[PDB]
């Protein structure tokens, strides 16, 4: 049967696996894909937004935590809104207390600690949002992904979301080129990688793509529907 | 499956425990309210004397405050808690805003208390539906009804409790501006309607009227006898 | 292949149109026709003695193969009216089962309530199928049983219980046919009611995709 | 072949194999139990319309209140459990007022939706506060108002997600009404056309024949504040249909 | 052993290819073939009395070879291959799903469950078709026994009727088997196609490492 | 059988299965080894590279719990990072109140007690991480301590945690570590890490090595890349 | 059933099965501990099994010092045992602080035992599966040996055993007390070693046994060194 | 007495070795050989008319049968199938004994492996019943054909009885073909389940009590 | 009653003594014998055609005694004693376990559960072995029926084949039973030996 061992985060399975945490991890797959890549001078997040209906506007997939840090959500939007608020307050706190932009890595550690507590204690469900966090700090451009499981990873590039393996595949092959890339080239590489996730009939449009760029001189900026047009125009056609 | 906890929502989005509490109200004694132009009349059936039981203790119709009166159908004990809590609020509003509570404010307060009970597991919804009758500062008569769910609606006339469906049909047909024209006529309409559902005659109906500034008056059994007689004679 | 989906989709669409039509036309018409067959005096015979059919076997008395002993004609004409009906119902019931089976949705962890409505309706359609199939078996059983009794009664002319058995077997079929025409009529009726009452859930089990929470 | 076991549906705070959090999904289904409400946002203003669903003639029509004013600029049409709506309309009314007190300005429709949404998100037992409903709220609200960016209509769902919608229908006939809305909506339509179009769609979806009593209609054109068409005004528009 | 690895690999490749052919090509074509077959008049006979085949057995106050009902034997010839083919295809689909079941692990049971559930309906179709096969065998034996009984006892009229009834019943049943065979074919496709992603890849893509 | 559902429950035969189930979690994780030699303690972790995309020198499984002590973890990483935080807090408190660097034996005990608490209550699951702590202080000496999910803490001359724990122990056993010096051990740890790694099952591994000892002046520190590189070469050559 | 599975529920025959299940856990460890009280000395002996050569022998001990003059041997789950020892050490100090004199051994067992009843009566926690035997010298009553079991029973015994071979060990000890000869320190230690050895059939070497003694002449609990253990072991073999 | 455990342990090690050889040798070889019999022209005859075998019973005509032989084609094919059916049955039994000998001491927890073994046992049991039945059908075919021929000869007039003998033969051919795919599929399904889950099947529980107790 | 107490006690002592004998001595010995028997060539005959034995029924263009297949009967003579021995030994174990089952109490049930699980398996072997016994009985009846049918109807060639087939099947079935009997004895040792502590002392 094995229906048992899956009811709560507090029950270890006979083989060492906490099933609810794994089930939570599945939530990220349900969400629309997002791709994050880094260059020696800039970090970029690109997202494929989805719309309930033609009349409805596309959802926000990229959110600004701070001038130096921004996140893209894949998964339940609610968990993301809650985590983002925690992150924003933690960043605001550092500026008031130490007058320094919070090191991006430190923030991810804090998101991990908050995220882990639901996993070990009966009660709150594990957060089911998967987050890609991008920021430029003194150490440099940084791209980190956070699983619904609290584990976090530092990545040269990553795509989280539905059909994200295809994007990871493109990113791995063209990865070396990214480090020395110019900003236009880096966003262009990313837009192509998310294109792979899209169904063959669908095409990247100004409406479904959101680009967020943070860099030594650029505060995190989410280029949106009409401002993605410069980055999108240079792109070619589906392979 | 989806009926054991108030918090759980059924596939199809029905919260079953709240609906079940509404079933409890149906098991309770009938109550009818008619909003006459100058009088609001609230009438409730009395189950039985039991011979050895004093009737003063059992009172379905109660006055929340000078201008607001309430009748209830449902678990009797819950009503006593809600009635008491409403009375504290009526007096507390008078303390806070110096002004007598409007009928609707009391209805909203009573409703919120009930909703609060439905919202969290660990508390059972109060199994009472109430008819709150009152006259506002403008002096317009107002009749409102509340349900275990916490929905409040204003009804020109309504019946809650067992047989409510039958009386409400009777009221829909019988109620007219002409019927509410005379204060006696209004009392007659409620008595006639309760008669439809009451197994016995006038012996089993307790009725009360609140006039524009007068306090709630529970009609004496004799006064009820006179009214039933006029109705029976006219029949 | 999209083309393979298309070929099944063509069949699925045809079944839907037939099911809708069968529900709004054949099922109501059949209820009326069957009620008439029941109303007819032929299936309403007051005395079973009239159904008794001649068994021309000579009895043994103190001082050859019997002449042809025909089947109870009255029962046979009734059987001839019933046999088409048993098959129309079986086929129409089968059309409905396929319609529901096709409509069942992709298996999912939850929101499987619509599937449940489909399952309970299928359980009724299955129960009806077994009962109706049995009716067809009974017709053959009667012929074999009546035949065996006729054979035994001629072979041992002395035993009269065998003669009674033939009369009883005929009596039972008349009684059974009356019940069977009643059941087919009832079955069309129950099927129409379960499907009509629960049509929405059966047609669209899981409903509109949940607005994005993702 | 039917696998109808479920067993992860009951109890929020449980992720189904496939990570679907079904209780929240079921709550979204509840809004279908509610009366249909349709909102069209046009440059001239945002119009909101709802079907009252009056059970008995004795019930006073005014009491049913499916369109309410959060503040002069923003109004809300709600479909779903009436009671949980009352709490959400209240958080909104206090938050608009709190913004006036703290910042002496009028909240944009989007911020007000974010504010009510934040309350809705709390159903997950996100906070330790005792006074938070465990169940996801069962109401969907369409919030329409004239702000700095001009007429805007945002739709909120029991999940707590909110999005701007040029036209949306929430309620029993939302599927189908939305389809019709898609065909009729053109960005250029004036509010007068939208009011007529929305009422045409409602007449089709509603079981009862449209009458001034059965419908509630409101508009928030940029100069004017939230306005609820009175029976006389409603009679004029319905007559045009 | 390398020869062993290759031998297993060839079987695995052929099975996966054959199933794609059955689902992509054979199943759509079969539905069409059956659909034309059912539309054809041979299995659309309004009066079963027409199906009746003359019995020459003499009536009492010496029996020639009593032939079978040609109309039914003709229909059987068309139906019998179909029953066997659907059985073969059901064996193929069961092995295909079985070879796609992952190594047992505590988690990711959904999908392994969908796979097992799909197997159950398919095994059930297999049982129903073997049940149909039994019915076909019974027709020849029962009609034959009936004819023999009628011949041995010319006097019993009912036995003569039984022969006609068993024949009339078979045509009706045989038409139903064809309709059912089409249904089984279509449902198999719907069950697999609708739930294909889980059936083909039950565990799902690798998703990070908690450990 | 409902005995295994919770840690509060005890099986009829006396076994608390949920704790045992938690111990199975560590076996899912990759092997990590710590060897204590006379000069100091060297820890090594085989960190599988799941994807080329992940940055090198990240997803670290070796954490510094205080200036003088280092922690190597195996098991669910999330719990481990959280346990590391508990340890760091405990170390800070010992310095704040008692005014000196925490003795490692005490640190292990305090963290173990925290880990054990989870074992008793039913609200919280046992932690799924097994970790090793090591420190060198001139007065205390070199100390390696390993804590199981149960909260059992013991001092190990050499220890291994993770999927290949049994295999590694056999190799560690033939080392005569007490006599050996810290620099030599780093090569040896690598040899064992390479031997245990299964190339077929695990595509590739990056060895992360850390050490504390007289050479590090009692500060746990990541081994300098020159030393690590030399060791990785020694290991491949030995693997032959 | 279902009468077991929660400590609070009582069986239809009033047996509180979960507490009984805990006593089983002590045996699962596979180690036995014997304590015997002499005229002037109290000794606790336990089997020390080191599973791996790598483990440092010094770290593994079941003998702990609750206070300078009270010593305890805890048999059962190792982790639970350490937890109880800390509570005992805290309780022992708290007595000195509040009352100004060293806790009497009986009172330490009583406090520790009473804590165990709370676990036995409250739903969330699990009875700790360990048994603690305390040895101390009270000036008024001479040497004392007390055992507290997971139930909360706190009896004091002239001699006792805990572990897999407790029943056999008790029988051996019972025969020796019945033929009372009184016990000198050497005899008290010798009786303990002979008992553990006979029940286990081990024929122990100094490394396998840990022996702790409290004497009136030197009241402080001391864990004997391997050499000291060997001396007694050699004497037993010689005679 | 430890002597008894040794005898069983020697039996177990023999069984273990036999199973490993069967999985890596007998099982793969049989899969290829069976597919060849399946693809052999004999089992793929397009027209069943070829299978029809002469029935020498005189038709009754207006004014005892000679020896009636079995359909040789079916008999030759059966002669090939009977060894194959038996060899699968024998091998299935050896595998079942090995899984059974490897089931561990019953315990409240750590029973995931025991469950894997039970899932595998479920499949082996399903296969055993199906394969045993194949053996039964072979015998039934001869008996049913034999009775049918007897009935046909005893009552020459009935012609359906003659059709029955022919029909029974056609079915056996269709069944033999289905049986060979089934045996091949069975060897294959067994190889896949045992191979995929061998680690757990060989060592279901392992040691989970360390220093915890 | 005291004499009765002696009578019941003596049965209890004997049951426990006999069981240890079956597991400690008889079961190992049987597994060796069954191993020796399977190795022997009579039950390892590659060509089942050799097993086929002549039927003298005259081919149709008066039948003498048609003897049974000596090879099958010879094998049955070796197999049938073994089948019966295990059925008896299984009773000894089924009864022994039942005596070990303790007074019913609300808890500490695991142990009673283990005893029941082993009991189910032993009972399951009993059903299989009884099934083998039924098969042995059927062969004689079925083979006789087939020879009779063939002799009565010489014209039908299939009946002659059926007799040959029944014999072939029997040899195979008998061979399998020897293998199953060995396995059934061996599994019994594994289940009882592995769970002996709980079966002997379920309560603890």
From Swiss-Prot, chain A:
Subcellular locations according to the entry: Cytoplasm; Nucleus
Q: Which GO terms describe its cellular component?
A: centrosome; cytoplasm; cytosol; extracellular exosome; nucleoplasm; nucleus; proteasome complex; proteasome core complex
GO terms in the biological process aspect are:
immune system process; negative regulation of inflammatory response to antigenic stimulus; proteasome-mediated ubiquitin-dependent protein catabolic process
- The UniProt record lists the Glycyl lysine isopeptide (Lys-Gly) (interchain with G-Cter in ubiquitin) crosslink at 114, 207
Q: List-wise, which residues carry Phosphoserine? A: 109, 176
Q: Which sites does the entry annotate for glycosylation?
A: 109
Per the entry, induction is: Induced in breast cancer tissue (at protein level). Up-regulated in liver tumor tissues.
User: What Pfam families does the record tag this protein with?
Assistant: Proteasome, Proteasome_A_N
Q: Which UniProt keywords apply?
A: Acetylation, Cytoplasm, Glycoprotein, Immunity, Isopeptide bond, Nucleus, Phosphoprotein, Proteasome, Ubl conjugation
Q: How does it assemble?
A: The 26S proteasome consists of a 20S proteasome core and two 19S regulatory subunits. The 20S proteasome core is a barrel-shaped complex made of 28 subunits that are arranged in four stacked rings. The two outer rings are each formed by seven alpha subunits, and the two inner rings are formed by seven beta subunits. The proteolytic activity is exerted by three beta-subunits PSMB5, PSMB6 and PSMB7. Interacts with NOTCH3. Interacts with ZFAND1.
Protein name per UniProt: Proteasome subunit alpha type-1
Q: Which organism is it from?
A: Homo sapiens
UniProtKB/Swiss-Prot annotation, chain C:
Q: Name one GO cellular component term.
A: membrane
- An example Pfam family from this entry, by short name, is PA28_N
What are the recorded GO MF terms, alphabetically?
A: endopeptidase activator activity; identical protein binding
Keyword Transmembrane, does the record have it? no
User: What keywords are annotated for this sequence in UniProt?
Assistant: Acetylation, Phosphoprotein, Proteasome
Q: Which residues carry this modification: Phosphoserine?
A: 1
What triggers or suppresses the expression of this protein?
A: By IFNG/IFN-gamma.
InterPro entries cross-referenced by the UniProt entry: PA28_C, PA28_C_sf, PA28_N_sf, Proteasome_activ_PA28, Proteasome_activ_PA28_N, Proteasome_activ_sf
Which GO terms of type biological process are on file? regulation of G1/S transition of mitotic cell cycle; regulation of proteasomal protein catabolic process
**Subunit details for this protein?**
Heterodimer of PSME1 and PSME2, which forms a hexameric ring.
Give the protein family: Belongs to the PA28 family.
Which PANTHER family does the record match to this protein?
A: PROTEASOME ACTIVATOR COMPLEX SUBUNIT 2 (PTHR10660:SF6), PROTEASOME REGULATOR PA28 (PTHR10660)
Record-given protein name: Proteasome activator complex subunit 2
- What is the species of this protein? Homo sapiens
User: What is the phylogenetic placement of the source species in the record?
Assistant: Eukaryota, Metazoa, Chordata, Craniata, Vertebrata
From Swiss-Prot, chain G:
Tell me which residues bear N6-acetyllysine.
96, 98
- What UniProt keywords are attached to this protein's entry? Acetylation, Cytoplasm, Glycoprotein, Nucleus, Phosphoprotein, Proteasome
> Which GO terms fall under molecular function for this chain's record?
endopeptidase activity; NF-kappaB binding; purine ribonucleoside triphosphate binding; RNA binding
Q: What is its main location?
A: cytoplasm
Q: Which SMART domains match?
A: Proteasome_A_N
Q: Which SUPFAM superfamilies match?
A: N-terminal nucleophile aminohydrolases (Ntn hydrolases)
GO CC annotation terms, alphabetical = cilium; cytoplasm; cytosol; extracellular exosome; mitochondrion; myofibril; nuclear matrix; nucleoplasm
Which parts of the sequence carry Phosphotyrosine? 153
- Which biological process, per GO, is one annotated for this protein? regulation of inflammatory response
Q: Which PROSITE patterns does UniProt cross-reference here? A: PROTEASOME_ALPHA_1, PROTEASOME_ALPHA_2
Phosphoserine carried by residues = 11, 57-58
**Compartment list:** Cytoplasm; Nucleus
Q: What does this protein do?
A: Component of the 20S core proteasome complex involved in the proteolytic degradation of most intracellular proteins. This complex plays numerous essential roles within the cell by associating with different regulatory particles. Associated with two 19S regulatory particles, forms the 26S proteasome and thus participates in the ATP-dependent degradation of ubiquitinated proteins.
The name of this protein is: Proteasome subunit alpha type-6
From Swiss-Prot, chain I:
Span-the-membrane segments of this chain are none
Induction, as annotated: By IFNG/IFN-gamma.
Which terms are listed as keywords in the entry?
Answer: Proteasome
What's one GO MF term for it? endopeptidase activator activity
Domain of life of the native organism: Eukaryota
This protein's record includes keyword Zinc = no
Q: Does the keyword GTP-binding apply?
A: no
Stored Pfam families: PA28_C (PF02252), PA28_N (PF02251)
Gene Ontology cellular component annotations, sorted alphabetically: cytoplasm; cytosol; extracellular exosome; nucleoplasm; proteasome activator complex; proteasome complex
Can you cite a GO biological process for this protein?
Answer: antigen processing and presentation of exogenous antigen
Q: How does it assemble?
A: Heterodimer of PSME1 and PSME2, which forms a hexameric ring. PSME1 can form homoheptamers.
This chain's function reads: Implicated in immunoproteasome assembly and required for efficient antigen processing. The PA28 activator complex enhances the generation of class I binding peptides by altering the cleavage pattern of the proteasome.
Question: Which family does this protein fall into?
Answer: Belongs to the PA28 family.
Q: What is this protein called?
A: Proteasome activator complex subunit 1
Organism expressing this protein natively = Homo sapiens
Tell me the classification of the organism that encodes this protein: Eukaryota, Metazoa, Chordata, Craniata, Vertebrata
């Amino acid at each position: 049967f094995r229906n048992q061992y899956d009811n709560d985060v507090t029950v270890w399975s006979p083989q060492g696996r906490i099933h609810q945490i794994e089930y939570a991890m599945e939530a990220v797959k349900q969400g629309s894909a997002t791709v994050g890549l880094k260059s020696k001078t800039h970090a970029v997040l690109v997202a494929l937004k989805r719309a309930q209906s033609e009349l409805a506007a596309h959802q926000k997939k990229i959110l600004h935590v701070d001038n130096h840090i921004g996140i893209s959500i894949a998964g339940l939007t609610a968990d993301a809104r809650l985590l983002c608020n925690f992150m924003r307050q933690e960043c605001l706190d550092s500026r008031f207390v130490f007058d320094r932009p919070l090191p991006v890595s430190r923030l991810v550690s804090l998101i991990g600690s908050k995220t882990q507590i639901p996993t070990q204690r009966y009660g709150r469900r594990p957060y089911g949002v998967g987050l890609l966090i991008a920021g430029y700090d003194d150490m440099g451009p940084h791209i980190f992904q956070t699983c619904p499981s609290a584990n976090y990873f530092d990545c040269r590039a990553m795509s989280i979301g539905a059909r994200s393996q295809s994007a990871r595949t493109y990113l791995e092959r063209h990865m070396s080129e990214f480090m020395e890339c110019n900003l236009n080239e880096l966003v262009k590489h990313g837009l192509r990688a998310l294109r792979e996730t899209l169904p063959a009939e669908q095409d990247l449009t100004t409406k479904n793509v959101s680009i967020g760029i943070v860099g030594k001189d650029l505060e995190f900026t989410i280029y949106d529907d009409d401002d993605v047009s410069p980055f999108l125009e240079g792109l070619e056609e589906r392979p | 499956s989806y009926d054991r906890a108030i918090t759980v929502f059924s596939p199809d989005g029905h919260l079953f425990q709240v609906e079940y509490a509404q079933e409890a109200v149906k098991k309770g004694s009938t109550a009818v309210g008619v909003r006459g132009r100058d009088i609001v009349v609230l009438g409730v059936e009395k189950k039985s004397v039991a011979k050895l039981q004093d009737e003063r203790t059992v009172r379905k119709i109660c006055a929340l405050d000078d201008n607001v009166c309430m009748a209830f159908a449902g678990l009797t004990a819950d009503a006593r808690i809600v009635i008491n809590r409403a009375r504290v609020e009526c007096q507390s509003h008078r303390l806070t805003v110096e002004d007598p509570v409007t009928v609707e404010y009391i209805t909203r307060y009573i409703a919120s208390l009930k909703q609060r009970y439905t919202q969290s597991n660990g508390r059972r919804p109060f199994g009472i539906s109430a008819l709150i009758v009152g006259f506002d500062f403008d002096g317009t008569p107002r009749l409102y009804q509340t349900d275990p769910s916490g929905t409040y609606h204003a009804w020109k006339a309504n019946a809650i409790g067992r047989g409510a469906k039958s009386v409400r049909e009777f009221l829909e047909k019988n109620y007219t501006d002409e019927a509410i024209e005379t204060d006696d006529l209004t009392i007659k309409l409620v008595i006639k309607a309760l008669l439809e559902v009451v197994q016995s005659g006038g012996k089993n109906i307790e009725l009360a009227v609140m006039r524009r500034d007068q306090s709630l008056k529970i009609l004496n059994p004799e006064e009820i006898e006179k009214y039933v007689a006029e109705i029976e004679k006219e029949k | 292949s999209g083309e393979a989906r298309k070929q099944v989709e063509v069949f699925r669409q045809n079944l839907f149109q037939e099911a809708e039509e069968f529900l709004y036309r054949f099922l109501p018409q059949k209820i009326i026709y069957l009620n008439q067959l029941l109303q007819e005096d032929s299936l309403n015979v007051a005395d079973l003695t009239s159904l008794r059919a001649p068994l021309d076997i000579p009895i043994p008395d103190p001082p050859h193969k019997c002449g042809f002993l025909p089947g109870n004609e009255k029962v046979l004409s009734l059987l001839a009216l019933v046999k088409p009906e048993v098959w129309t119902l079986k086929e129409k019931c089968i059309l409905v089962i396929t319609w529901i089976q096709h409509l069942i949705p992709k298996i999912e962890d939850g929101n499987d309530f619509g599937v449940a409505i489909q399952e309970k309706v299928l359980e009724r359609v299955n129960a009806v199928k077994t009962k109706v199939e049995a009716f067809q078996t009974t017709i053959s059983k009667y012929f074999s049983e009546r035949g065996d009794a006729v054979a035994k009664a001629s072979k041992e002319t002395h035993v009269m219980d065998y003669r009674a058995l033939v009369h009883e077997r005929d009596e039972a079929a008349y009684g059974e046919l009356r019940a069977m025409v009643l059941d087919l009529r009832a079955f069309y009726a129950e099927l129409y009611h379960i499907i009509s009452s629960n049509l929405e859930k059966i047609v669209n089990p899981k409903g509109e995709e949940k607005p994005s929470m993702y | 072949m039917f696998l109808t076991r479920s067993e992860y549906d009951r109890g929020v705070n449980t992720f189904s194999p496939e990570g679907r959090l079904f209780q929240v999904e079921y709550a979204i289904e509840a809004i279908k139990l509610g009366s249909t409400a349709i909102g069209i946002q046009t440059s001239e203003g945002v119009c909101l319309a709802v079907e009252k669903r009056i059970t008995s003639p004795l019930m006073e029509p005014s009491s049913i209140e499916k369109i309410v004013e959060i503040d002069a600029h923003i109004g809300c049409a709600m479909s779903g459990l009436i009671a949980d709506a009352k709490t959400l309309i209240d958080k909104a009314r206090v938050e608009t007022q709190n913004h006036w007190f703290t910042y002496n300005e009028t909240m944009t429709v989007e911020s007000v939706t974010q504010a009510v949404s934040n309350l809705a998100l709390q159903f997950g037992e996100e906070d330790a506060d005792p006074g938070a409903m465990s169940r996801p709220f069962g109401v969907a609200l369409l919030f329409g108002g004239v702000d700095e960016k001009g007429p805007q209509l945002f739709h909120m769902d029991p999940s707590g997600t909110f999005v701007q919608c040029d036209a949306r229908a929430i309620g029993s006939a939302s599927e189908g009404a939305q389809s019709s809305l898609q065909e009729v909506y053109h960005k250029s339509m004036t509010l007068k056309e939208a009011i007529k179009s929305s009422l045409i769609i409602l007449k089709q979806v509603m079981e009862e024949k449209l009458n001034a009593t059965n419908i509630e209609l409101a508009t928030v054109q940029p100069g004017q504040n939230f306005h609820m068409f009175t029976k006389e005004e409603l009679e004029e528009v319905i007559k045009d249909i | 052993q390398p020869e062993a690895q290759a031998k297993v690999d060839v079987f695995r490749e052929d099975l996966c290819t054959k199933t794609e052919n059955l689902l992509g090509s054979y199943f759509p074509k079969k539905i069409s073939e059956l659909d034309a077959f059912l539309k054809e008049p041979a299995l659309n006979e309004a009066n079963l009395s027409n199906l009746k085949a003359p019995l020459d057995i003499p009536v009492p106050d010496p029996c020639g070879p009593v032939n079978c009902n040609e109309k039914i034997v003709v229909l059987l010839q068309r139906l019998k291959p179909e029953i066997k083919d659907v059985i073969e295809q059901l064996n193929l689909v069961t092995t295909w799903l079985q070879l796609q079941i992952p190594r047992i692990e505590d988690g990711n049971n959904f999908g392994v469950a969908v796979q097992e559930k799909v197997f159950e309906l398919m095994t059930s179709l297999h049982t129903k078709l073997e049940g149909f096969h039994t019915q076909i065998s019974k027709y020849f034996s029962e009609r034959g026994d009936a004819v023999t009984k009628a011949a041995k006892q010319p006097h019993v009229g009912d036995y003569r009727q039984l022969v006609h009834e068993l024949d009339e019943a078979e045509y009706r049943d045989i038409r139903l088997m064809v309709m059912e065979i089409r249904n089984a074919y279509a449902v198999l496709y719907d069950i697999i196609l609708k739930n294909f992603e889980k059936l083909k890849k039950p565990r799902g893509e690798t998703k990070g490492m908690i450990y | 059988t409902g005995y295994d559902l919770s840690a509060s429950t005890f099986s009829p035969d006396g076994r608390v299965f949920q704790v045992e189930y938690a111990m199975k979690a560590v076996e899912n994780s990759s092997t990590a080894i710590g060897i204590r030699c006379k000069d100091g303690v060297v820890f090594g972790v085989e960190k599988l590279v799941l994807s080329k995309l992940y940055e090198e020198g990240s997803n670290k499984r070796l954490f510094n719990v205080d200036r003088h002590v280092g922690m190597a973890v195996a098991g669910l990483l999330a719990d481990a990072r959280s346990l590391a935080d508990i340890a760091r807090e405990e170390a800070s408190n010992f310095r704040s109140n008692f005014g000196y660097n925490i003795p490692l034996k005490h640190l292990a005990d305090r963290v173990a007690m925290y880990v054990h608490a989870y074992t008793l209550y039913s609200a919280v699951r046992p932690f799924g991480c097994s970790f090793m702590l090591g420190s060198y202080s001139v007065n205390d000496g070199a100390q390696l301590y390993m804590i199981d999910p149960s909260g059992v803490s013991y001092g190990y001359w050499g220890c291994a945690i993770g999927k290949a724990r049994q295999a590694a122990k056999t190799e560690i056993e033939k080392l005569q570590m007490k006599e050996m010096t810290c620099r030599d051990i780093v090569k040896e740890v690598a040899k064992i890490i390479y031997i245990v790694h299964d190339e077929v099952k695990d595509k590739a591994f990056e060895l992360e090595l850390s050490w504390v000892g007289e050479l590090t002046n009692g500060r746990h520190e990541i081994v300098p890349k020159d030393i690590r590189e030399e060791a990785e070469k020694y290991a491949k050559e030995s693997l032959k | 059933a279902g009468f077991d599975r929660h400590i609070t529920i009582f069986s239809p025959e009033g047996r509180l099965y979960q507490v009984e299940y805990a006593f089983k856990a002590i045996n699962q460890g596979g180690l036995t501990s014997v304590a015997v009280r002499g005229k002037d000395c109290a000794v606790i002996v336990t089997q020390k099994k080191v599973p791996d050569k790598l483990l440092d022998s010094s770290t593994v001990t079941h003998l702990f010092k609750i206070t300078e003059n009270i010593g305890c041997v805890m048999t059962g789950m190792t982790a639970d045992s350490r937890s109880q020892v800390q509570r005992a050490r805290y309780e022992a100090a708290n007595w000195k602080y509040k009352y100004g004199y060293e806790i009497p051994v009986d009172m330490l067992c009583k406090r520790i035992a009473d804590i165990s009843q709370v676990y036995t009566q409250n739903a969330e926690m699990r009875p700790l599966g360990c048994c603690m035997i305390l040895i101390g010298i009270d000036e008024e009553q001479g040497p004392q040996v007390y055992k507290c079991d997971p139930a909360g029973y706190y009896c004091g015994f002239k001699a006792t055993a805990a572990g897999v071979k407790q029943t056999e060990s008790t029988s051996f000890l019972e025969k020796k007390v019945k033929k009372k000869f009184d016990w000198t320190f050497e005899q008290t230690v010798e009786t303990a070693i002979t008992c553990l050895s006979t029940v286990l059939s081990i024929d122990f070497k100094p490394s396998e046994i840990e022996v702790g003694v409290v004497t009136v002449e030197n009241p402080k609990f001391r864990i004997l060194t391997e050499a000291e253990i060997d001396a007694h072991l050699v004497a037993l073999a010689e005679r």
